[PDB]
Amino acid sequence: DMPVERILEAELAVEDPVTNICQAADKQLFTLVEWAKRIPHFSELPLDDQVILLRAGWNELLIASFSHRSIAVKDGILLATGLHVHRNSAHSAGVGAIFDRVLTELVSKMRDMQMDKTELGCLRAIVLFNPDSKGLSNPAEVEALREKVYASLEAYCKHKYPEQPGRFAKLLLRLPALRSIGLKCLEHLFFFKLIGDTPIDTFLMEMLE
């Protein structure tokens, strides 16, 4: 019902600094939809619930991806557009605090444990299948799907890294940081939109309205 192989194949299928960030977000919103469509059972949910799951999740899903992408980078994030944002660029643009939280709580934690792409895919699929999302026609179903992802993820972790009995728990326990950081990032984008200092492209605009 939920093979880690399909989740990995979904990650692999889809592979002013604040202006560059906002352009990259917009670009990745399109990719995000394709990614989700390749997560087993997602495209079978009602269209309304697919929309709710992606509206509840997109920010955490984009942050999980660019954080994991940035593993191979000293004091920076790699954007989907091929540009880097260096610490000092982020700080100089006035998004230093959130950029530092991204490196310390996500990027360096992913690098330090060598989080693999199957593990990233699973965490993102758990995020996607968020049964707390308001207005779901069938939350029980979304929760079942989440249970199947994390069941698969634990089995993968136990088999692949048998020497790390804490790995599964450690992956799950980046999801609170992802939640905080996602909320802080929304708050920045609402402010950018509100003062309208920076271009916000049509899909990113829609995700904020």
């Binding site: 002013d16 604040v18 100089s92 643009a93 006035g94 998004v95 920045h188 003062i195 200092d197």
Partner: peptide, 12 residues
């Protein structure tokens, strides 16, 4: 157009 100042003040 005081981008950085506005951003740093709005934040909590």
């Amino acid at each position: 157009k005081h981008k950085i100042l506005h951003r740093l003040l709005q934040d909590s």
